[PDB]
């Protein structure tokens, strides 16, 4: 499929950036997570980035560590995540869906089989957080065989060789890291380096989404103004889940308000 390509073409025609929330699948339970995701979409999410709970999420700070923990407390497994993904896609045919994976969950039981399942349920991209471009060959090859975009990360310090590799190897979107360290709203990153955003375009990279530390509408607006195609926010969204665990209706209301405000910032 061409879900990201279609999305970015539509947004470009409207001079608009993408706003892409991250949540952990099955946090705080399967049913509530499905409602959360429908709320994100209804509030204006252009695409989704969805984490499969993993025992050892080494690129995530405490907020997302705790989301993984909540999902495990609810008994969430990767098989249940794929059932959720199929349902989400059946409700929402055009929204791009990206997974945030750790390598063992992809490799476990066969890399090719993992990407085949992604294709079956209608996932559009997979970002394997602990596979750098240097180790990426079997992942990116399997992704492409199954019509899945492999997503790669461009650090703010990326040298020319790395930019060329990310531009060549990735598809769908290019993940532009706002800073070093791990996920977290508590740590704000930098503005996209115009050198990076411009080199990526020079090398015909997939459109850039900036992520890590994006928690306010002003940062969304700023990312787009710097030349990124959009912005991803995770911890800020997951914190609303965490704060409102005891109040599921209030949780959805606050998620709706927050996403609406973040999406509004991406408009020209």
């Amino acid at each position: 499929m061409e879900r990201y390509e279609n999305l970015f073409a539509q947004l470009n025609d409207r001079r608009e950036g993408a706003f892409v929330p991250f949540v952990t699948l099955g946090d705080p339970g399967i049913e509530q997570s499905l409602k959360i995701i429908d709320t994100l979409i209804d509030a204006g999410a252009d695409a989704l980035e969805l984490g499969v709970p993993f025992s050892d999420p080494l690129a995530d700070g405490p907020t997302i560590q705790n989301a993984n923990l909540r999902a495990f407390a609810a008994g969430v497994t990767p098989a249940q995540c794929f059932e959720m993904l199929a349902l989400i896609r059946e409700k929402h045919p055009t929204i791009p869906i990206g997974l945030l994976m750790y390598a063992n969950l992809v490799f476990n039981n066969g890399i090719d089989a993992f990407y085949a399942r992604c294709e079956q349920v209608g996932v559009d991209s997979v970002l394997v957080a602990d596979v750098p471009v240097e180790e990426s060959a079997p992942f990116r090859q399997a992704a492409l065989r199954h019509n899945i975009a492999p997503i790669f990360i461009c650090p703010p310090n990326a040298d020319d060789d790395l930019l060329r590799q990310v531009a060549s190897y990735g598809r769908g979107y290019t993940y532009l890291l706002s800073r070093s360290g791990v996920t977290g709203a508590e740590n704000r990153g930098a503005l996209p380096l115009h050198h990076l955003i411009e080199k990526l375009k020079e090398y015909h990279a997939a459109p850039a989404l900036q992520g890590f530390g994006i928690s306010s509408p002003e940062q969304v607006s700023a990312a787009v103004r710097a030349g990124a195609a959009g912005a991803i926010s995770g911890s800020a969204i997951v914190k609303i889940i965490e704060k409102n665990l005891a109040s599921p209706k209030q949780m959805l209301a606050e998620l709706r308000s927050f996403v609406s405000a973040m999406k509004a910032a991406s408009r020209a």
Binding site: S55, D60, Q65, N104, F107, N109, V131, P132, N157, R179
Partner: protein, 390 residues
């Protein structure tokens, strides 16, 4: 792109987030440079000799083998400063940190021995040391936690995941992924992403080099086998390295069997796990059917980790080394036997290696065999554990 091969056959690699690749490349370059620098080598040798106490003795143990055709030597890493082999490689890694211009050290620890080793090297060499330790391990290891703090190290409990060693490993890498410009990650075993399995082997290989010289001096020939316990793999690869090309010399690694392999309560991924990707490496591990990292178990905290370094997985695959397991009860018997018959209190980790050598002897008592066990540490730390059981 790297200077050295990051793989041992299919095992190893650099499975870290992209943001950490420059840190690994920088460390690899500094290591390659240091290995060719006679001044670095002389500094390292001086610390090993005058601070740590190398060379360590090779002790013939006649009482234990009486009435058999086994001759057994123990390589006495228990006599190294700190009471275990870990001191060797922390000194070398601290010197690499300084070579790179870094002022801070991050380390993970489970049993606490690596945390203590890191803290002592950092105290000596003017580095600011912070140590991650799973909260469950902090609770179990008050003596080591207090030692780390006496040495000036910051000990940071880790409450995420299972609050144990793998969780401390994750947290050390999380920290490093934001702090690499000023901090070196002092990984505690011959595992993790390249270049750590290589660096740790090279900074432990004096164990086997000395053993070779000492056994040639005493016996006029190489051992029939060298035997070492395997937690993450450092003391065993340090003993094995200099013998890998001596094809007659058996290499035997001993994983913890815990309550018995059949119970699933063990720490023997090399022979009983399956290949996965975790902690920066492709290696055998204990994992659930759907690929979550499992809980390991051993009476000995130093062996209690659900994976193993990639060079051991490789040496097993090609048949150069053989790997076996020893249960808690077998390790306890070996501990008691060495105390009573040789007056040496061995670490419970090392007692796994000794227990396997004792089995080699007892099963085939008329087999001629010259064995070396790597006695990786002293067992003062274990006397209450052993007390509370007996």
């Amino acid at each position: 792109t790297t200077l050295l091969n990051p793989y041992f056959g299919e095992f190893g690699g650099m499975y870290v987030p992209q943001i950490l690749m420059p840190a690994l490349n920088q460390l690899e370059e500094a290591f390659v440079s240091a290995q060719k620098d006679p001044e670095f080598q002389a500094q390292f040798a001086d610390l090993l000799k005058n601070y740590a106490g190398r060379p360590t003795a090779l002790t013939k143990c006649q009482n234990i083998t009486a009435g058999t055709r086994t001759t057994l030597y123990l390589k006495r890493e228990d006599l190294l400063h700190g009471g275990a082999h870990k001191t060797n490689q922390v000194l070398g890694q601290a010197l690499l940190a300084k070579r790179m211009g870094k002022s801070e050290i991050i380390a993970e620890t489970g049993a606490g021995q690596h945390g203590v080793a890191s803290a002592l090297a950092s105290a000596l060499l003017g580095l600011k040391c912070r140590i991650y330790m799973g909260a469950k391990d902090v609770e179990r290891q008050s003596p080591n936690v207090f030692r780390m703090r006496l040495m000036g190290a910051e000990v940071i409990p880790v409450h995420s995941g299972s609050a144990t060693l793998k969780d401390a490993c994750n947290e050390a890498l999380r920290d490093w992924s934001g702090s690499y410009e000023t901090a070196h990650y002092m990984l505690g075993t011959a595992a993790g992403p390249h270049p750590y399995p290589t660096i740790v082997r090279e900074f432990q290989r004096m164990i086997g080099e000395e053993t070779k010289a000492q056994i040639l001096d005493k016996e006029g020939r190489l051992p029939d086998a060298v035997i070492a316990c395997v937690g993450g793999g450092s003391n065993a690869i340090g003993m094995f390295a200099d013998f890998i090309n001596d094809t007659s010399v058996g290499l035997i690694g001993v994983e913890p069997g815990g309550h018995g392999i059949e119970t699933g309560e063990h720490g023997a991924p090399l022979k009983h796990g399956r290949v996965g990707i975790y902690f920066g490496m492709k290696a055998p591990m204990m994992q659930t059917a759907d690929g979550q990292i499992e809980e390991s178990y051993s009476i000995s905290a130093g062996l209690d980790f659900p994976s193993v370094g990639p060079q051991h997985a490789y040496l097993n695959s090609i048949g150069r080394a053989d790997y076996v397991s020893i249960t808690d009860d077998e390790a306890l018997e070996a501990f008691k036997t060495l105390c009573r018959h040789e007056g040496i209190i061995p670490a419970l980790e090392s007692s796994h290696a000794l227990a396997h050598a004792l089995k080699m002897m007892r099963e085939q008592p008329e087999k001629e065999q010259l064995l070396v066990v790597n006695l990786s540490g002293r067992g003062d730390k274990d006397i209450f554990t052993v007390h509370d059981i007996l």
